Every structure is written in structure tokens, then in C-alpha cells.
Symmetry: D2
Subunit: 461 residues, 4 copies
């Protein structure tokens, strides 16, 4: 009874089906295998590698306390590494968990086949979803509303597993520092992110409990204001699998049941909104499984990414992104739509910059969001219409705090004109300290002309 | 697909296996059946019926919100009621959960047999234990005999149970009555019973809220507070566990996860606290296990009355009885102390003590009660033998080092020095005059001398 | 420039006029002189001597830090001690503060005369009042006779006093002894007296800390909490004011400033609270004023003993005496209730009640004591006349609406309904059985019937 | 018994000697007289007029509640206004308080003389000092240490007065809006300062009590760090006389006595430091009573005042000044010294800009501070030596928080190089996002060349 447990993106010990199976079966030999060449162009970015290294150290200590140890292998081939581990330890079984990336599907199939050839049994489980994409049908659905209605109607077919108690212990293995996860010049700069975040599954649990117990009830109200911290902040923890989506779902549903019993309408609204947000991730993976004339201007892109456009919401969004590796949903919508519909940029550049900076860069969610904003989905905002900054501000930033915190040189403009300065008269722009051109930039491209150019490209249709 | 779900002592909706099975299968018809005559002499007491009524109302509202409704039947026969429900609704299946009381075992077997006669399928699950009593044995296939070896084996093994999410919705579907005609409460004792709401608040929605707070903020100090009887030091989960409003597997998982983190980061106090709590949890398993596997007093009435009202003369006994009658609870050391006093000092028939505890304790549970009384009475080699009586001064110095527990429940002794507060018959009359205390006039002289009772027990 | 500062009842350093004068003048020699024989029958009681000793130690450390030192003399004559200090240090002046006790007036006059004979100058100031008793009179030059008119006039007038900062440093300069040979405390009663530190903590540094917190966070609710006897509702400043560790002018200014702000911003509740507090403050002035301007019992011993131990049968009386003996304090309504009970029910000689209050109360003050006893006894037209006795049910409904005060100090009555908790001899035996209460066996039947005592008082 | 109470800079009712005297004497007629022409060039600035208007409204409500009313007169002559009030109400006496400004001294003397001519008695008191400047002598002292030692040795000769209880009531009077305190274009911009401050004597008391009860004990430690809020923030309240300096002094001294009794060395240090700070104001008024080759470059001055010099501490100081009307003592030292010793500016411009922006512009304290930094006092730092930014930062801003809060575009520079960026190599300036010239300015003048030019002007001596 010797089993090899393969770790890829499930860096936790609670509700881990493959680990629970192997540990109940017999003796275990955990392993992590890192192979840059197989990833292709889905190679993770800097903000992701930093979080991955911290989580790997946390997990290694956790395993060593229990009684076994993590082993790290950097290689050029995965089959070779698995076969070498087999030849050295004399195992019988191999177990792992499912992923739905294209590369992941191909690699899993190849491993399964080339291992069953030599008379060694393999097994895979499901650890990252509520319903598998091949389990919900009408034909596949085509709209989120019908999809989510069906999913709510059905009943879940999964149980939760307790963590293993102890592990019975049992080549070119290396150490966490020779994996080459971080460059040499960028260690002191990357170290600053510890000011806001702290990776590890022991910290994911501590965050979720506090959110559920004290902040859910106000979600329906705070979930439209971009200042402070209003949402839950669980995306980087969910991307690496340090928390269980089934766990989150159960906690939210139990709160909703109590609130609905005692007639708390605000509670019901908040819980429903949160669960709809949770279900959008399922829908993203589902659609990815079931359905597999720009201006090449460089300085425009550079100004976009540094925050010198002239529009306050865009400027503050980019300013917070580069400094904390995060930004609100409305700001994601706003900045992405600006980048495509205003400066007419190739959307690949925007996707790639988000890939390298965002602390939670996830392929399916990224693609779904960009399709939504770009108007390739009938459910959304069509490419034709551009929104008005004054209305955006009045709706989401009613008092100017978000502006005045990240752009201090605009701390004494009245709340009436703080979002569209090119409107306010020179008398007010003198009474205030603001001075366009000298200590704040005049708008990089006029709104009307860009609207006309997009009208060309649209009325062509 | 029509199923009848039977509710007896599992008044919750999370981690309820029978309910989860029926709801996933099809349409459900929940029912609660109350039958005084079958209980015998294990009929529940007043403090238990009060809690049961409040929990039943809470559960009924909870079910009605989901989309079905609880139905309450008071009868003289259980088979008749089940058959009537069958005849009226046209079901196919019956499901329930396991209990390990003698009456429960007999009734479950009879129901299973007399129902399988008529071609209706039945099913029972396990909802109240970690390991079933028939699953743990020694190398020669023999049951264990000592708690230490038993718990070592249980720790070594691995658990064979999963947890189930609550059902989402229920598809709805005789002499049914209402929560007020069950006759759970007398007529004169409603205003007096109402006062207990000052301290407790029943319901599974409240059990969850209590457990989360205990685990998050008080576990780490359990190893220290768990020997002081004043304030609130322990967890206070026994009445919630007796009625099954919380899941023992849930409690076990939470404690174990905390222990893993503390052991990783080298927190010795954390490890000690977690181990103590889990040993406490395992003692309940052991109690049910032993119950499953192994099925010259002075008839003085006024002595018993003085015992139960709190006029013995010994401060710890007096404060224990005083808090018991007023809040329906008392600490483990106080349970040990009062029980041992009642048997070894006044030589009372132990049945009376068992029965008074049965009627007053808010969490009267048969197995735990029997296990505790055996331990204190010395019928178990692991314990304190009947021969030795303990010294009040040492008891006090060990558990009540500053006299707070005494001075709160016995205020007329609020200016006796901490040195003599536990054995007043020692302090000289000069100190008993400087203090306000006056034995015989506003506090009782000891009801029986310690030495003479020790001699009589030495005879026996 | 050598001055002798005399300390009697002004144990503070802020707003001390005599000390400020001497320190600004030159070199100082502080002194405290204790003389039991001159006091007579106004000798302070045990709870007062305890507080006095703690405050004296605090003050001595405070002075030694500044740069001089307190000197303590126990003697048989005061003139002899002052003359000896003069002969040893070669001073020029003597300064002190005013008191309005009879003994104080006589002693101050004698000292002034016998010192001015020998060519040494003396001086006295005013440190304990707002207006001196000889400064307020009516249009015909007559003293007032009712509190309402008196306080209206006092409010109308304007204050004629300033506040003085504490001295910065002191330039230093017989049978002197130590704080332990003054004989302030007996030998057997040190361990028992030590327990009061559980609730109180003497010293002027603590009086300031208490006043600031009260004013900043509790004044605004005074008008509401000031009629409920449970918990802590009032300010608790009386023992600090009796020893002069805080300045009544300071208290007055703080309250008035809060009232001005609240009245500006239209806060009716704030205005009511502030007015009530200041009326309370002014009652002390009135007490000293009247004392300055106007200089057939049953001799039953066991009745008195039962009264003082708390075995009468009436819950409010029992809880009041129970809290008095244990903390040295009680609420104003409880003072009214217990005093009126003692005179109008058991027909006791009022001297005994006055003396027991004198020995137990932590703030025994002559003028306030006399004023309160006159009010309750009906020798003042403003009050409640001796004829009428109040009803316990109405008293309870008015002041203790939920029974908490009863159930905390009398735990053996913790499960009587809130309807009958104040007059148990009314509730039927069915309720007295459903509850645990049992009159005669664990709680006393009323010591004297209310109706018969009312008839006897109706005779008188 | 009719008295006229004159209000100039004592906008409180507690410990007001003139008001207490008049109210105890008889019937009162309070008055405030505003006369722009007599002020000269000591005319108050915008941030001062805003605070003055709010405090005047607060005081007017306070008086009207008591039972009299404030009367506001804007005029061209003060003698004319006083004589008109006399002719209309038929008074007997006039009372006011002392000020030590040059204009104040002249005006008070003229009023006293021209009023005593007509047989009307006048009276003045002392309301703003501990010791009058003519009361301490050795000859006058010449150094702060000896002065303060003598002042500590002596004993105070002042008592405190309770507020009056009620007032017995009794021309071109106008309203708070026709005084013309605020311009028309700058009302919406000025309104923003309410975000941080709240004027009024009822608020000054509430602030002082909280400071004394909870923050004094840490003064000796927090009093060297420029980030957050460490000091007491009482200067604007003390400038307008809404709190009593004698009150502050008594509270601090009482705390010190208790701490010294119970052997708390840190407590003693904190209390002594605070009282030395208090005494520096006395010394400033004392010296003012007893002892009555720049580059004319405009764009350099503009860059200084907008915050585009290149030096992080200067930039953050000016950025916080324009937005909240305040700055720490070390920042005042740093910015003033920079302005004189680096860009060689005429010091009058710096004095005037501070005059218009600072919320607490006070003549004596301003002059004393500028003399100290400029080296005209032997007790100080001589003009010759310029300080090193790295050492300044290590001493006062050990972690870079003050920099990263007011200059967010520098939020990922390591704490080692955050104060002197022109030192860090281009590898680190690439790993960080910072880019000199494009989104942050290269130093406006080199440190070495300015040091050489100042060495010319100094070695001339
Ligand atoms: C252009 C664009 C790009 C995006 N890129 C990403 C990305 O790389 N990674 C990513 O995880 N999300 C992405 N999103 C989705 C969304 O912006 C974030 O998931 C959201 O900010 C999560 O933050 P939160 O947990 O604090 O918010 P919460 O409101 O607390 O969200 C709770 C959880 O619900 C899920 N969720 C909520 N809304 C969405 C949504 N619209 N789409 C998918 N899942 C959702 C997430 O898992 C999230 O953790 C993108 C959206 C847009 C418009
Ligand atoms: C004479 C006597 C009578 C008892 N009668 C009862 C009874 O009727 N009902 C009852 O539930 N317990 C009984 N006990 C056990 C024990 O006194 C209580 O279980 C304990 O007070 C539970 O309170 P707690 O949850 O606050 O303490 P905790 O220390 O928090 O206990 C945690 C849990 O562990 C279990 N547990 C801990 N110690 C024991 C133990 N010695 N035996 C069994 N289970 C234990 C209980 O389920 C308890 O809820 C009795 C003990 C004695 C000596
Ligand atoms: C029978 C009887 C005896 C009393 N004996 C004393 C005594 O020995 N010493 C004593 O100080 N008070 C005495 N009082 C007055 C009153 O009971 C207490 O002053 C009051 O409890 C003070 O407590 P407090 O400061 O918490 O209440 P608060 O309401 O906060 O009182 C504030 C202050 O006002 C003064 N005050 C308020 N009410 C009265 C009053 N009726 N008479 C005089 N002063 C008042 C006290 O100085 C008190 O400190 C007696 C009253 C009665 C009826
Ligand atoms: N059909 C969809 N596809 C992708 N994203 C969506 C979709 N619907 C809503 N969202 C996201 O969820 C947010 C909800 O906004 P609203 O539709 O106003 O409730 C949107 O702003 C998007 O960020
Ligand atoms: N073998 C046992 N049987 C029954 N109860 C026990 C047993 N061991 C311990 N207990 C209970 O657990 C407590 C633990 O006490 P100690 O043995 O001192 O740790 C005892 O005081 C009993 O209440």
C-alpha cells in the first residue's frame, strides 16, 4: 500500500479528496513538480509566483508537522519525474485532482494513459467545483439567468471530508530557493506587498470566518461603493485552492436560511447577491469547457498604465492597482472599457498587463470578464454606448473620497466638479489649487472625437 | 416516492442523515410523536420539558419556512399512529435515527419488525456518536475495561463518517394537535419556569452561535480555567448536546483543527488545552459504550430536605445547591463534591440523589448520570475509593483560592478572612466576633460532625 | 518667615487656601495632631478610621515628594503640642481652615485667643463651603426657614470665591510618632477590615480620577437612573467629600459648565439631570446652614439585633442591611426605607439607629446625618409626616420594577415571580410551593404584623 | 452701572477677566468691532478669517443663550464707534484685555487717553500670558535656558475666574454676513476644511481633556515622528484665546506631580517636554516686547509652493500643508531651511505664504521660528551647515510611511533608498515602478553646487 499524491493547485489539507483517499488507504509520498516548459504562454506572472512561494513554504511546514514532508522537483519532463519516483520508492498508486485548463486536460490524459500501460493504477477526483460541466443540460444553456435558475433548482451531489489525522512516512529533489520563482533584483520591491496581504490556508480560514460573521449583512449596500474595503477579498485565496468553495457556499446558505426565517429582507438581498457572485465562477468554467484597426501606439499604452490619462477614476484605479495588486469590480469594468473604447488599443496588451499585475490572475474569469465588457455576449453593455463620468461618479463615488485619497493634489475641488474638471470654470479652478497642464494633465483624447471614431466603426455594422 | 421522517431527539436540520436521505429521495412528511406511557420511569423532568417545548417551537418555525410543516401527535400507541399516517397519506418509506436507551432499542426493533411485515421498507441511521459501540475491540476480540486504553485505541483508529449539508427545500404532502395540548407544562408553574430565560435560550440557531464564539475566543485558556468553579469557565454545551441541536462530529472537527495549528507553531499551552477538551468529549463516547456492552442507609427525611435546600453548614455544598436551584446547572467539581457528601456523610439512599438531579438538572442524561455516579461511588477501579473523605480546607485552597464563589452565593459571609472562610468551626470566637458571622443565629452549625461520620463509614 | 500649617480635615493639596498662603509667604512646617479626649462622643467610628489612615499615608507620600514632610503627634492637649512646636522651630505664624462642628468652633476660638496672647499671629480661612452661613438672609435680615426659598436665593446671588493652584515646592524646616502608633485600628480587626479594598480606594489622586469619569460619561442619565436602587446609579462621592479630598467648588463648576452647554443646544434631559444634581449639591449647604443658625419606646434588644442582621422578613429592608454590612454604603431610598422602618414599625429609640449608622457608614457626617433623620422623623414640615406608612408593593413597583435588587442580595428567593416578590405573605401556597420558597424554614415570616403596628402608631 | 465689554481675541467665556469684572459689577453691553484699515499689513489671511467667522457664530449663540447678545460693527474709526455706543446707551465704564502686538499697544494707549479726557473710566486686564514681560529680570535675560530656569523658580501670581452665570441686558450694527470675511468664489473650496477641524470653545475644551487624559504619557516618544498625529494640536485654539493657557499649565503640572510621586521616569520626561514647549510661547512674547543677494526667481518659488522640488520630505510637507492647513514642527524646520539655504529665496515670500496658508498664523511665534532657523540667534543651527536627507529620514521617518502616504507614486521603493532616490541604481529604479523625469521630478538644483554657493556667502564672513 504505497501511494503518490500529486499537488498542483490545491494547497490545503481540509476537504482534499485525493489526500484523504490516499491517507485512509495506506502510506503516502506527497510531491510537487514544477515544469516551466510545458506551460507555454500560460506561464504565471510575478505577483502570482510571489504568492505561490509563500504558500508553498506554509504548506511544507504544515506537512512536516503532521509527519511526512513535501518534495519539490524542477524538471523538463513530468513523466520522467513520476517514473523516477516510482523506481525509487516502489509505489502502487497515483492520485490527483481535476483541472479544466486546456494544458491541464491534455497533460492529465497523457499521464493516465502512459501510466496505465505499465500496470500502475491511477485515480483523479474533483476538488474545485460545485457541479461538473457535463452534468447540467436542458442541450447546454446559453444565458446565465437560465443556467443559474437550473443550478439552484437541482440538488448538490457532494460531501465534505475531514482532514487526515497523521501520515505514515516513506531523484534530483531540491529546495524552495532553487525553483527560481523570484528574480534577483525584485526581491526587496516585492517584499512590500506583505503590508496588505498574508498568504496561507491558515489565514484564508481566519479571513472567511470574520467576513461571514460580521460583514455579509451589509453586502447589498456596500457592494456598489468603491472606497475603503467593501467586498470580501477572497479571490487570491480561491485561485490557489486554499479554501473550499463548497465550504463558502454552505456558510452563506445557512446564514440565508436563518435570515429568511426571521423576516429580514435586507439579509435576504445580501445573501442572494453573494451567492449569485459565487455562481458566476461556475458559469465561467462551464462556458470555457463547453465552448472552446487598432492604433499601434506605444506611448498611449504607457500613459494608460502609469495613470496620466486625465480621468480621475481611471487614474486612481491604476494608482491603486500598481501599489496593492487589486481593484474593485466597477473599476475593472471602467478601466477595461476605457482602454478599448477610448484609445482603441489591442485588447491583448490589456489582458497581458492584467495577467502580470493582478494578484489573482485566473484564465476563465479573465476571459469571461473581457468578453462581457467587449460586448461579445448579448448579456452586457454593447460596444456602441460610452458612459458619462459625472453619472458614473454620482452613482459609485458620491463624495469624492476615493478620488481625494489616491490623487491628493485634488483635495480641494468641490464635490460637484471633482469628476469632470474640464467643465468647471477658471474661477473655480483658481480658487482651488488645481492647475491643468502644470500639476494635473489635460484629457489625453477628447471624448467627443473618440465617440465619433467608434461611431464610424460601429455604424459600419 | 413518499417518505415519513420520524423525529425523536435530533432537533436540528444540519448533519441530519435521515432527513437528508428522505429529502434527496423525494417527498417528505415530518412527524413528532409523544407517548408518556411507553417511557416508564425514564419520563423526563420539568426542566427538560421546558427546554423541549421551546426547541419544538423553534424547529416548527424552521420547517415551515423551508416549505413543509411539523405534525405533533399525542397517543397511547406508536404503531397505531404510524399506521394511521400511512393509511392517510399513502407513503412508501419510513426513516429515523438511532438511540441507545433500553426503551429506545426495544421500540426500534418492534417498529422495524411490525412494519416489514406489511411490505413497507424501513431504514435507520447513526446521528449521535463517533464510533458505534460494536466497532471497537481488543486484539482478542474483547471489549476494553479502562478508559485510558479505550481512548488510546479510539485515537489510534480513523473515523468512518462524513458530514451532510442541510436540505435546500422540501416538497410538501389523524388526531394531530398543537404545541399547547401536548401537556408539557403544568398550570401553576408557568410563571416560575419563565424565569430561566434569564440565563439560557434554546434552539439550534443559538447552539451554533454559542459554539463558534467558544471555539474562537475561550478554548486557549481551558487548561487553566478548567479547575476554578467561579464565573463561567467551561463551555456550557451539555443541554444543547443532549437534544441533538449540535453535531458532536462538528465539535470534534473544530477542536482538532485548532489543535493542529497550535501544535505546528509550538504552543504548549494550546496543546494542553485542546487535549483536555477532546478527552472530555471522549468520555461521553465511553459512557455510551459501557452502557451498551454491560447492561444500611438512614431513612431520614429532614436530612434530605436540609441537603436539598442548602442548610448543611458546609460552604461549598451550600453554594452548589443554591446555584443549582436558581440556574439549573453546576460545575463538575461541585457535582463531585455534593454527590460524595450526600452518600459518604449523611448516608442517604443514592436513588434519592439520582432522582433530584433528574428533576432539576437542565441536561439530565441517563448514560452520563450513571457513569458519574458509579465513578464517585467507587464501583469503578479508576476513581476515588469510598474509604477516603476529603478535607474542606484543601478543597477550597485547590479550587476556590480567594473565596469569591463563597461570598457571591452566600453574602452573609462577606467579611470572613480568606484563611478561615471554608472551615468556620475552626476560627476562634475573637475572629467570629470581629466578623459579622454568628453560627446558630444567621448561619448553621455543621449538621453532622465530620469525625463521627468518618468513624461510621470506617465501620462499614 | 516661618509658618505652621495645621491639617484637620482637608487632606488635599489643590485648592487649599491655608497651605497656598503659607507656601507663598515663606517656609512651612505641616503638622497633624490627633487627640481622642477632646472629641467627646463625636469620636469617629471604625469604618472612618480605616479610611483616615489610608488617606494619611497617601498624603504623607505626596508631601515628601514635594520637599517637606508630615509630622504626626498624639497628645492629651493641643495647646501644649502647638507651643512645643513653636519652642522647637521658632516660627512666626499659624494658619488653618474652618470647621462648623460645635467642638471645632470652641477649639478654634480657644486656640486663637491663647495664641494671640503671646504675640504670635494666627489666621483661618474657608475651605469647605460655597457661602458662609452668616451671609444669606431675607429682606428683613432674617434667616430662611424652607429649603426652596433658601436655594432660590442662593441661586439668585453670585459666588464670591476664587480657586487657588497647588503649591509648586516647599522650603523645608517633641514626641513625634509614626502612622502605626496613632492606634487607629484594633488588633483583631485588621484582616477583616482589609476586605473593603475590594470596592473602595482612598486618596485625593483617586477622587480626581473618579470625578472626571463621572462628569464625562454618567451625568446625562442622572435624572433617570437616580430612582433605581440596583447596580451603581449615583455618583459615589460622599466619603471623598467628607474628608475634603475634593473641592466642592470644583464639583459645582464642572456641573454648571455642562448645564450651560446642554441648555444652549436644547437638551431637555440634560437640563433636568444637571438641575437635579445641583439641587443635591445644595442640600449639603443647607444642612450646614441650619446647624449653624439653629443649635414610649420598647427597650427590646433582640428586635434591634434582628434589625441589624437582616432577619425582619421584608425584602427591601433585608437587602439594604445585607449590602450595608458588606460594602459600607446604601442608596438614598434604602436609607429612607430602613430608617423609617426602624422608627415607625418596631418603635425603637432613634439613638441606637443613629449610632449604628455612625459606626458602619463609610462617610459618617454629623450635619447630613442629623438633617436626614429630622426629615424622615417628621420634625420638619417639608417631608413625610409620622402618621403615614408606605406600602411595600408600591415601593417596589416604583423603585425596583424587576426584582433584581432582591434576587441579587437574597438568592434564596431567585424563583418567585416578579408580581409577588415584594410582599410574599400575600402569594398563595400553590405559588409558594411551585417556587422553592418556604417561610419559617429558609426565610422568615414577618417579624411584626403591619396592621397592628399601624394601630399602635395610630394610638401615639 | 452700565459697562461696555470689548471683545478682540478672547472668544471664550471661562477665565475671561474683563467679562467677569463687568458682569459682577452690573449691566453689560458686549461688542465686537472690525476695522480693516487700522490693521495695516498685519491683516489676517484667508485660513484665519474662515476660523474667525465660525468662532464668532459659536460665541454669538453662546451669549444669546445666557441673556445678552453680541453686536458687530464694521467701521472706519474705532473711537467713533465707541463714542456712538456711549451716546446711544448711556454707559459709565469700558473694559477690555491686553494684547502685545505693536498696533494693539498703540491703539490701546490712544483709546485710554481719548476716553479719560471725557470723564469716562477705562480698565484693562491680562488674559493671554503667565508672566507679564516687565516682571522677570536678572537686566533682561538673553537665553531661553536661563529665562526658563528663572521662570520655573519663581511662583505664579494669578488666579482663575469662574464664568458669569447670567447677564442683565441693555448705530450701524450689522450681521455676520456683511462683515465681508469671506470672498464669493472661495466659499465651496474653503468649506472642505471642516473635514479635519471644528472651531469653537466648546470644542477646544473637549479636545484638551482627551489629550491630557490619554496621550500625554507618550509625548516624549511620539514627539519626534512626523507621521499620523503625535502632538497635541492646540495652536489654532490658543491663537484665538478659546482656551486658557493657565488652564493647560495647571493640568500638565498636576499630572507631573502624580507621576513624579510614583516614580515614573517616562512620565516625568513627557511632562517636562510639554511644559518646555508651553514656555517657548512666553519667551517669544517676552523677546518681542523687550527688543522691538537673493535670486528673484518666480518659477522656483512656484515649484517650491506646489511641491515639485524633487526632495520627498519637502514634497510631502507642502502637499499636506495645502490640504489641511497644518504641518509638524520638524517639517516646518525642514521646509523653511530648504527655502532659504537651497534656492536662495527672499525670506519675506516664505513668511507671507505661511501667513496666508497656516491655520494659526501668529506674529510672535512666526518671527521667533524664522529667526531660529535663519541663525540670527546663537542658540540654534548656524547658516553654514546643511543637513543630509538620509540622516533626516533615518531619524524622523524610519519606515517611509509619511512618504508613501502623501506621495503614492513611490509606494514600492525599498525603505533603504526612499529618501535619496538619485542614489539608487537604475536596476532598482527599474524593478520599482519609479521613473525620474516622467512621473517624478529629478532634483531641481544639485545639493553640492548650492552648498558651494552658500559657502561663498558664508566664507565671505
Ligand atoms: C475585466 C474583468 C477582469 C476580471 N478578472 C478577474 C480575474 O483575473 N480573477 C478573478 O477571480 N475575477 C476576475 N474578475 C471578476 C471580478 O472582478 C472579481 O472576481 C472580484 O473582484 C472578486 O473580488 P471579491 O472576492 O472581493 O468580490 P466578491 O463580491 O466578494 O466576490 C466573491 C467571489 O465571487 C466570485 N465572483 C464575483 N463576481 C464575479 C464575476 N463577475 N466573475 C467571476 N467571478 C466572480 C469570485 O470568485 C469572488 O471571489 C474580473 C472581472 C472583470 C470585469
Ligand atoms: C455526579 C455526576 C453527574 C453528572 N451528570 C451529568 C448529566 O446528567 N449530564 C451530562 O451531560 N453530564 C453529566 N456529568 C458530566 C459532567 O459533570 C458534565 O458533562 C459537564 O459539567 C459538562 O459541562 P460543560 O460542557 O460546561 O463542561 P465541558 O468541560 O465544556 O465539557 C465538554 C463536554 O464534554 C463532555 N464531558 C466532559 N466531562 C464529562 C464527564 N465526566 N462525563 C461525561 N461527559 C463529559 C460533555 O458532553 C460536555 O458537554 C455528570 C458528572 C458527575 C460527576
Ligand atoms: C437617614 C439619612 C442619613 C444620611 N446620612 C448621611 C451621612 O451620614 N452622610 C452623607 O454624606 N449623607 C447622608 N445622607 C444623605 C444622602 O443619603 C447621601 O448624601 C447620598 O447617598 C450621597 O450619595 P451619592 O453621592 O452617591 O449620591 P449623589 O446623588 O451623587 O449625591 C451627590 C452629593 O450631593 C449631596 N447630597 C445629595 N443628597 C443629599 C441629601 N439628601 N442630604 C445631604 N447631602 C445630599 C452629597 O454630598 C452627595 O455626595 C443621609 C440621608 C438620609 C435620608
Ligand atoms: N452576463 C454577465 N457576464 C459577465 N459578467 C457579468 C454578467 N452579468 C453581470 N456581470 C458582472 O456582475 C456585475 C453586476 O452588475 P449588474 O448587472 O448591474 O448587477 C456587472 O457589472 C459585471 O461585472
Ligand atoms: N475513569 C473515570 N470515570 C468517570 N469519570 C471520570 C474518570 N476519570 C475522570 N473523570 C472525571 O473527570 C475529572 C478529571 O479529574 P482528574 O482525574 O483530576 O483529571 C474527574 O474529576 C471526574 O469528574
Amino acid at each position: 500500500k504505497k501511494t503518490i499524491v500529486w499537488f498542483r493547485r490545491d494547497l490545503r489539507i481540509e476537504d482534499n479528496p485525493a489526500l484523504a483517499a490516499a491517507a485512509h488507504e495506506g502510506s503516502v509520498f506527497p510531491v510537487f513538480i514544477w515544469c516551466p516548459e510545458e506551460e507555454g504562454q500560460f506561464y504565471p506572472g510575478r505577483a502570482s509566483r510571489w504568492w505561490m512561494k509563500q504558500s508553498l513554504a506554509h504548506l511544507s511546514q504544515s506537512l512536516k508537522a503532521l509527519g511526512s514532508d513535501l518534495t519539490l522537483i524542477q524538471t523538463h519532463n513530468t513523466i520522467s519525474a513520476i517514473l523516477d519516483c516510482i523506481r525509487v520508492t516502489g509505489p502502487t498508486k497515483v492520485v490527483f485532482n481535476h483541472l479544466y485548463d486546456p494544458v491541464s486536460l491534455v497533460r492529465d490524459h497523457t499521464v493516465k494513459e502512459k501510466l496505465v500501460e505499465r500496470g500502475i493504477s491511477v485515480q483523479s477526483y474533483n476538488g474545485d467545483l460545485l457541479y461538473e460541466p457535463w452534468e447540467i443540460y436542458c442541450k447546454p444553456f446559453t444565458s446565465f439567468n437560465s443556467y443559474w435558475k437550473k443550478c439552484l433548482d437541482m440538488s448538490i451531489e457532494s460531501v465534505m471530508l475531514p482532514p487526515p489525522w497523521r501520515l505514515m512516512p516513506i531523484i534530483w529533489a531540491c529546495s524552495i530557493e532553487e525553483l527560481g520563482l523570484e528574480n534577483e533584483a525584485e526581491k526587496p520591491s516585492n517584499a512590500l506587498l506583505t503590508r496588505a496581504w498574508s498568504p496561507g490556508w491558515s489565514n484564508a480560514d481566519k479571513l472567511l470566518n470574520e467576513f461571514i460573521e460580521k460583514q455579509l449583512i451589509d453586502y447589498a449596500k456596500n457592494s456598489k461603493k468603491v472606497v475603503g474595503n467593501s467586498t470580501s477579498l477572497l479571490s487570491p485565496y480561491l485561485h490557489f485552492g486554499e479554501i473550499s468553495v463548497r465550504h463558502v457556499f454552505q456558510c452563506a446558505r445557512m446564514k440565508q436560511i436563518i435570515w429568511a426565517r426571521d423576516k429580514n429582507s435586507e439579509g435576504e438581498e445580501s445573501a442572494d447577491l453573494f451567492l449569485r457572485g459565487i455562481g458566476l465562477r461556475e458559469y465561467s468554467r462551464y462556458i470555457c469547457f463547453n465552448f472552446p484597426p487598432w492604433d499601434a501606439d506605444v506611448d498611449k499604452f504607457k500613459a494608460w498604465r502609469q495613470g496620466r490619462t486625465g480621468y480621475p477614476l481611471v487614474d486612481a484605479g491604476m494608482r491603486e492597482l500598481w501599489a496593492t495588486g487589486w481593484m474593485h469590480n466597477r473599476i475593472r469594468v471602467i478601466v477595461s472599457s476605457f482602454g478599448v473604447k477610448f484609445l482603441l488599443l489591442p485588447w491583448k496588451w490589456g489582458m497581458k498587463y492584467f495577467w502580470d499585475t493582478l494578484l489573482d490572475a485566473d484564465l476563465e474569469c479573465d476571459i469571461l470578464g473581457w468578453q462581457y465588457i467587449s460586448g461579445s455576449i448579448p448579456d452586457g453593455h454593447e460596444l456602441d454606448r460610452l458612459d458619462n463620468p459625472a453619472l458614473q461618479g454620482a452613482k459609485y463615488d458620491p463624495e469624492g473620497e476615493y478620488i481625494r485619497q489616491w490623487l491628493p493634489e485634488l483635495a480641494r475641488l468641490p464635490t460637484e466638479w471633482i469628476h469632470h474638471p474640464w467643465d468647471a470654470p477658471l474661477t473655480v479652478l483658481k480658487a482651488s489649487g488645481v492647475e491643468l497642464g502644470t500639476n494635473y494633465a489635460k484629457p489625453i483624447v477628447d471624448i467627443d472625437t473618440a465617440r465619433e471614431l467608434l461611431a464610424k466603426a460601429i455604424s459600419r455594422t
